[PDB]
Amino acid sequence: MNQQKSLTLIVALTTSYGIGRSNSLPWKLKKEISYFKRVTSFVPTFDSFESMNVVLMGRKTWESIPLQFRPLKGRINVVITRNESLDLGNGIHSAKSLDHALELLYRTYGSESSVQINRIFVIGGAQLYKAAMDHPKLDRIMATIIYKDIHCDVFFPLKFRDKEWSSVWKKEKHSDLESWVGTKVPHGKINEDGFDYEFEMWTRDL
Ligand SMILES: NC(=O)C1=CN([C@@H]2O[C@H](COP(=O)(O)OP(=O)(O)OC[C@H]3O[C@@H](n4cnc5c(N)ncnc54)[C@@H](OP(=O)(O)O)[C@@H]3O)[C@@H](O)[C@H]2O)C=CC1
Numbered sequence: 663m664n665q666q667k668s669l670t671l672i673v674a675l676t677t678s679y680g681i682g683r684s685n686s687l688p689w690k691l692k693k694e695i696s697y698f699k700r701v702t703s704f705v706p707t708f709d710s711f712e713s714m715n716v717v718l719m720g721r722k723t724w725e726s727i728p729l730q731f732r733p734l735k736g737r738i739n740v741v742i743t744r745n746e747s748l749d750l751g752n753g754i755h756s757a758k759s760l761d762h763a764l765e766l767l768y769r770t771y772g773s774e775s776s777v778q779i780n781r782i783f784v785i786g787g788a789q790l791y792k793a794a795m796d797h798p799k800l801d802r803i804m805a806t807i808i809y810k811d812i813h814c815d816v817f818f819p820l821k822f823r824d825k826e827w828s829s830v831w832k833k834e835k836h837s838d839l840e841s842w843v844g845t846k847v848p849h850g851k852i853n854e855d856g857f858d859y860e861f862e863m864w865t866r867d868l
């Protein structure tokens with residue numbers, strides 16, 4: 663009673679797998695953030711009466727979000743921190759691991775709760791991404807590929823777009839991305855402030 667739902671990782675990364683710098687994002691992509699918000703928030707209409715998605719994040723990531731945007735609005739936020747202490751918070755879930763997170767959510771949001779969980783997202787930390795990539799329930803990566811080798815100092819931990827991982831991870835057709843995401847999504851290269859990026863969806867079999 664815990665390993666029911668699959669997990670989905672969402673991430674914006676460079677062709678060199680760069681995801682962050684001096685604790686922030688090394689780009690300003692207002693439309694990319696907008697896609698992040700849409701994907702992490704989307705719940706099918708019949709279910710949206712009573713269902714919410716969950717965002718799981720590292721502590722370094724909760725801190726890196728501008729204070730004005732936390733908790734990520736309209737999603738159940740859980741911060742994962744090996745050190746369950748005084749950090750605050752208007753109603754804010756803390757777990758010491760990804761699995762302890764799942765147990766807290768299934769305990770807190772059972773049939774018995776007015777709020778029901780739709781999809782569960784891991785939204786980063788390189789270190790949390792690492793745990794997710796090792797988790798037997800992670801089966802989907804929503805990747806925004808940034809076609810510039812922007813200087814980063816934090817990297818996504820597994821080269822999932824590369825030949826060595828290509829029998830495990832497969833990029834899906836764009837219509838399948840749109841099906842999963844529940845709307846039309848810009849297809850192909852988008853340019854916002856200096857460089858091209860594009861939305862991808864990768865899966866693996868559990
Ligand atoms: N480009 C993208 O899409 C994204 C980029 N980022 C970027 O990533 C950088 C953050 O990466 P990273 O340094 O790895 O930070 P994380 O957000 O993964 O790390 C923060 C902390 O979360 C806890 N934590 C993470 N994993 C575990 C685990 N398996 N078990 C217990 N606790 C855990 C902390 O433990 P403790 O409290 O014990 O220290 C860890 O130090 C920032 O630059 C941020 O801007 C973030 C999200 C998305």
Ligand SMILES: CCOC(=O)CCCOc1ccc(OC)c(Cc2cnc3nc(N)nc(N)c3c2C)c1
Pocket residue numbers: 672673674686687694695696698699723726727728731784785786805806
């Ligand atoms: C209400 C209007 O207000 C808004 O627009 C929302 C504010 C969001 O601002 C952010 C500022 C910094 C930031 O660094 C972490 C994030 C997190 C983020 C951003 N893109 C992201 N993009 C992708 N593909 N994946 C992510 N996982 C991701 C993640 C975690 C968000």
Ligand SMILES: [Cl-]
Pocket residue numbers: 698699734735
């Ligand atoms: Cl958001």
